[PDB]
Write a protein that binds this DNA or RNA. Structure first.
Ligand SMILES: [K+]
Ligand SMILES: [K+]
Ligand SMILES: [K+]
Ligand SMILES: [Mg+2]
Ligand SMILES: [Mg+2]
Length: 136
RNA sequence: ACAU
DNA sequence: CGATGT
């Protein structure tokens, strides 16, 4: 089982969980940063991992790329497959933004098609995903 | 247990 | 040590 180097890797970063959430996508081979989301003041790790995958799908579709996406998040991979982010985060004024983005990401999934493989990055074999924030 |  | 999730 080998790394598919012609791929996009994504990952969340946070200050607290729940806390300030951001995410980014990088070229797995080179580490080049292809997109970075502006920090969101309150979210969860899994909401961020979900948004990162969906952004990756939208990024690749816009560019007519068939590359797969790596994610280290078992949860977010499942949520994307299901087209449903099963977060426990309370909905209130301070979580409104992240929930708006999660709702809109789900909506995008429900109105678009893709063949992009969404693959588990095997951290136990390969070390940290290339999109990692180096904060742990 | 597993993944974050 | 704590949290988010299956
Ligand atoms: K990190
Ligand atoms: K990890
Ligand atoms: K647990
Ligand atoms: Mg991750
Ligand atoms: Mg990481």
């Amino acid at each position: 089982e080998e790394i598919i180097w012609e791929s996009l890797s994504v990952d969340v970063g946070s200050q607290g969980n729940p806390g300030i959430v951001e995410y980014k996508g990088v070229d797995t081979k080179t580490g080049e940063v292809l997109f970075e989301r502006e920090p969101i003041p309150i979210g969860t790790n899994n909401m961020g991992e979900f948004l990162a995958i969906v952004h990756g799908l939208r990024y690749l579709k816009e560019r007519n790329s068939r590359k797969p996406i790596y994610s280290d998040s078992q949860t977010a991979i499942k949520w994307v497959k299901d087209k449903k982010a099963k977060s426990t985060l309370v909905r209130n004024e301070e979580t409104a933004l992240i929930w708006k983005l999660v709702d809109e990401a789900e909506e995008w999934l429900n109105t678009h098609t893709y063949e992009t493989p969404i693959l588990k990055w095997q951290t136990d074999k390969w070390g940290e995903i290339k999109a990692d924030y180096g904060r742990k």
